[PDB]
Amino acid sequence: YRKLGRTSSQRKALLRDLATDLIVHERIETTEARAKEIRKVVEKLITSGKKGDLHARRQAAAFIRHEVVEVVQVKNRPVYALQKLFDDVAPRYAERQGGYTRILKKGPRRGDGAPMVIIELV
Amino acid sequence: TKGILGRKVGMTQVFTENGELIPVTVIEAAQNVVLQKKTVETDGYEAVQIGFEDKRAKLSNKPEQGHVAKADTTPKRFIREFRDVNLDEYEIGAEVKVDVFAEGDIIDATGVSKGKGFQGVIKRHGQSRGPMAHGSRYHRRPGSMGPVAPNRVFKNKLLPGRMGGEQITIQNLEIVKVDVEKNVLLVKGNVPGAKKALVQIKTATK
Amino acid sequence: MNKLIDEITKSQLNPDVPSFRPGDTVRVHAKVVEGTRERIQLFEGVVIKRRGAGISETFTVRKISNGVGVERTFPVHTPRIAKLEVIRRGKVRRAKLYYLRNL
Amino acid sequence: MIQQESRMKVADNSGAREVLTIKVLGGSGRKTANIGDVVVCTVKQATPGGVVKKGEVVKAVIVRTKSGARRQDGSYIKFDENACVIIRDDKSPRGTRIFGPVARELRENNFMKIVSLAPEVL
Amino acid sequence: AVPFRRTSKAKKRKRRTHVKLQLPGMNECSNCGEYRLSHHVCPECGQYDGKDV
RNA sequence: UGGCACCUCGAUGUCGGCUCGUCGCAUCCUGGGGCUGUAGUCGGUCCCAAGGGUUGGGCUGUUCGCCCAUUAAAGCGGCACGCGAGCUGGGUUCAGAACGUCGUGAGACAGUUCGGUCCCUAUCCGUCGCGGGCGCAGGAAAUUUGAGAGGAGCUGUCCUUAGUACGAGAGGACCGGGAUGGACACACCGCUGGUGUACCAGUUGUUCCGCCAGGAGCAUCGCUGGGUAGCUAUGUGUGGCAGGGAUAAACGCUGAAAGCAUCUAAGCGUGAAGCCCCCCUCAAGAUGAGAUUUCCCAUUUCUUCGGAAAGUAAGAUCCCUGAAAGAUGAUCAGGUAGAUAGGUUUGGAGUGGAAGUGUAGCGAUACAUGGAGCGGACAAAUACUAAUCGAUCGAGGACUUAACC
Ligand SMILES: [Mg+2]
Ligand SMILES: [Mg+2]
Ligand SMILES: [Mg+2]
Ligand SMILES: [Mg+2]
Ligand SMILES: [Mg+2]
Ligand SMILES: [Mg+2]
Ligand SMILES: [Mg+2]
Ligand SMILES: [Mg+2]
Ligand SMILES: [Mg+2]
Ligand SMILES: [Mg+2]
Ligand SMILES: [Mg+2]
Ligand SMILES: [Mg+2]
Ligand SMILES: [Mg+2]
Ligand SMILES: [Mg+2]
Ligand SMILES: [Mg+2]
Ligand SMILES: [Mg+2]
Ligand SMILES: [Mg+2]
Ligand SMILES: [Zn+2]
């Protein structure tokens, strides 16, 4: 696996943040190496969401971030990213075995020349 | 004097008849074919050329197809030459099987060793390192480059550089088992290379 | 792991070994084979660890003899073990029982 | 693995109790000794009233090591201590009794009296 | 540690033989006819593989 | 040990050790031999021989030396007393202080004693690795010969021949055969172990996820018990085998000059760890650019011949997915004629019995469901995701003579 310029705990935090971002926004822009790691991370999360039971949910809750996706008027109650993963994203790919993300190359960044890429869950 | 080509599969152990326990290397040697015979009146020396592994037509070119079309076979991934053989055997287009060897034979194993990258003197050359305490600032360094008089440094002053990936021969290895149906040869000991590496198995020269 | 290695080494795989775990007491009947005469010697003790896979799996047995601790390591499928008995089954929480050395 | 300056517990009846090794015999640059090897050594502790006295230079055979031996059938043996037996110019002991278990490798090296006097030959 | 002699113009120009840079790997877009990098999205129409991105 | 004062005072770092060696032979061991006050055993001395080998500690800053314990042996010298832009700084050789001694004194003693700043980002050659260009009279893909070069080269003990030969006895072999070591070298991870910061478990403090339950952050990876792949030694496998050609010192055969004799002059033969081979690796830029098998062919424009350019063939690359490779280039496996990488599904090592629920207990907790749950890097299937689509480079083969035709 890739060390991404940072220690173990910093790398874990970066991976958790990026995976939650891709779940919430469904399309993000980043560098190529980060995309090639969150590929694995996010697809394992989606598989856990497809499995569906309480053990899988508690395992996904140890990695996903506690963030609010939206507030829904149902008494207005917020929706969290774990709820979106288990209730919305996972049923979308109930008939697809693998490969829930794709990577699309964009080009270099002005400030440092880094190769920037788009990753989306489709 | 016999020869064959194979791939290194792995490394394991077997129990002998006495109850001993010995380590073995597994060589898989399917699809060997005789491709060409070199004679003194045409080449200057005598040898037999053997091709080892079948490969897809997409991965070959016209010269390869032309060369193997004389032996009525598909293009081969590896091709090598064996000298000090008897050319009265080895018909063109014939098959070579692990039957040429029997349990108890003594062989020579040729391969290319595992690759290490850029390496320093004490790993590459087994040098001795300096003191680690007592005020020293000299730990993993090459040593003195030489005396003062020549105004230069001599050849074979050993320095860092690329380490592995060299041709190695190991002599006097014993064959423990031959399995014709699986095309498998069991050799006592170990051979150079990593897994899936090409190995030449030949009769020992001494 | 390799499938060819598994198929080649399958015939030499002993089927008479019983089930045991690290932690329980066993008795080993080992063939002591001198030059011309072979006898049977008994080693009884606690299984301290089990390690490996397939034909290259080994296990270690610990005993106290005459005030000195002795450890003995065998291949599981060796033909020099005439037979293996499980005397009693223990209750441990570990796979490797190295803390008994210091105890 | 017994090299110079390593100490051993004496496992026989003679007056010695602890011994420090001076030299491993059998070659110019030899460094370590195993079970069944002879060493030159000096007596560090002794039992008052015994045949062997403190400060004596003697030679001894190693009868059990904490890094033991491997047999040809593929098995191993190991002990919880390093122990030696004080011997003469021939391979005979200088005591009348031998304590603790002894390795089977003493028999191949033709230390017959030590093997016969031992409580157990493992 | 320190240069014994100054470097001449010819020697400096010889050392600078390989300090050039390469030419981008680009070709024309099948959709809009503009130039683009291979295996990259077209920045002028947002196309890749003949689809909107 | 000295003599001289020829280079260096706009600086040529000075003892001992460490790291790394290389050379000479006046040879310490091992190999061959002549003489002996050579019976045998053990030795002495000289000749040939530099292939390899030639120890760990106590004391002292020490070199040297003495001692302890080994070894086949513990050689002697050169290289700025080899090696400080490679290291150390114990000693010598600054400033402080003290003893003995000398001086009226300030001070001094190469007498002693305790303490005392070791700078530099490598330009050129040289050394060790890795690329690009062009050449090698057409353009390509593989397989190779070997001029030349580097490596390796060591040696112990035990059994038998045989208590024989020899000797008054005491004692005690050569030559030959067999077994097993030390030190060194190469390869590798099946075994024994080490490591294993995105693997499994236990646990302390505090903060957080609204609370319980279950979890997350920080505390060296918080600490503690294990451990996969990979990398490794102290682990395992193998090696220096058996020989050939010509010789050294030496011992002879034949043989004259010199009717004899003579190893020499003509001519032959034995004869060393040494020489050249045998063994391992590199090697055609070996500009002397070698050889074999296979593939593509004789296009179109201009030129005044020379020749130029412009589409290609066989073949390669740009770009992209990577690892068995790797600083980067390079190398190798692949790009839908697809298992190259990730995911998915089944496994494997490893750890040791998940969550939820139920039962027993006042409770800490125990038991069942159930070798359970988890499971980086390991295995096999599977085109779900990305290797889409383009583009670039790349021959038309000079002259002379001789053989065939
Ligand atoms: Mg990477
Ligand atoms: Mg990047
Ligand atoms: Mg590598
Ligand atoms: Mg590398
Ligand atoms: Mg340091
Ligand atoms: Mg030990
Ligand atoms: Mg000690
Ligand atoms: Mg001056
Ligand atoms: Mg000392
Ligand atoms: Mg000796
Ligand atoms: Mg000198
Ligand atoms: Mg250095
Ligand atoms: Mg010509
Ligand atoms: Mg701390
Ligand atoms: Mg740990
Ligand atoms: Mg030889
Ligand atoms: Mg399990
Ligand atoms: Zn476009």
Topology, pairings included?
The structure is cut from a larger assembly and holds chains A (122 residues), B (206 residues), C (103 residues), D (122 residues) and E (53 residues).
Chain A lengths: L7 H18 L1 E5 H20 L2 H8 L6 E6 L2 E5 H12 L9 E7 L6 E6 L2
Antiparallel strand pairs in A: 1-5, 2-3, 4-5
Helix pairs in contact in A: 1-2, 2-3, 2-4
Chain D lengths: L6 E4 L5 E9 L13 E9 L10 E8 L4 E2 L5 E4 L3 E4 L18 H4 L3 H6 L5
Parallel strand pairs in D: 1-7
Antiparallel strand pairs in D: 1-2, 2-3, 3-4, 4-7, 5-6
Chain E lengths: L8 H7 L10 E3 L6 E3 L9 E2 L2 E2 L1
The structure holds magnesium ion (17 copies) and zinc ion.
One magnesium ion (MG) binds next to loops of chain D.
The structure holds one RNA strand of 405 nucleotides.
Outline:
Chain E: Pfam families: Ribosomal_L32p (PF01783). Chain B is mainly beta and about 210 residues long.
Give structural notes.
Chain E: InterPro entries: Ribosomal_bL32, Ribosomal_bL32_bact, Ribosomal_zn-bd. Chain E: One of its GO terms (molecular function) is structural constituent of ribosome. Chain E: This is Large ribosomal subunit protein bL32. Chain E: Keywords: Metal-binding, Ribonucleoprotein, Ribosomal protein, Zinc. The structure is cut from a larger assembly and holds chains A (122 residues), B (206 residues), C (103 residues), D (122 residues) and E (53 residues). Chain A is 48% helix and 24% strand. With 122 residues, chain A is of the alpha+beta class. Chain A is built from 4 helices and 5 strands, in the order αβααββαββ. Chain D has a 5-stranded mixed barrel. Chain D has one domain (1-122). Chain D is mainly beta and 122 residues long. Chain D contains 2 helices and 7 strands. The longest helix of chain D is centred in the C-terminal third of the chain and has 6 residues, at 112-117. A two-stranded antiparallel ribbon of chain E has the order 1-2. The termini of chain E are far apart. Chains in contact: A-E, B-C, B-D, C-D. The B-C interface holds B 9-10, 12-15, 19, 21, 26, 28, 179, 182, 184, 186 and C 2, 4-5, 7-9, 12, 31, 33, 55-56, 75, 77-80. β4 (68-75) of chain C pairs antiparallel with β6 (76-79) of chain D. The site of one magnesium ion has 3 residues of chain B, from loops. The site of one magnesium ion has 5 residues of chain A, from α2. The structure holds one RNA strand of 405 nucleotides.
Task: Fill in the keyword field for this structure.
part of a larger assembly; 5 chains; A: 122 residues; alpha+beta; two-stranded antiparallel ribbon; 4 helices; 5 strands; globular; C: 103 residues; mainly beta; 5-stranded antiparallel beta sheet; binds magnesium ion; binds zinc ion; RNA-binding; Large ribosomal subunit protein bL19 (chain C); Ribosomal_bL19_sf (chain C)
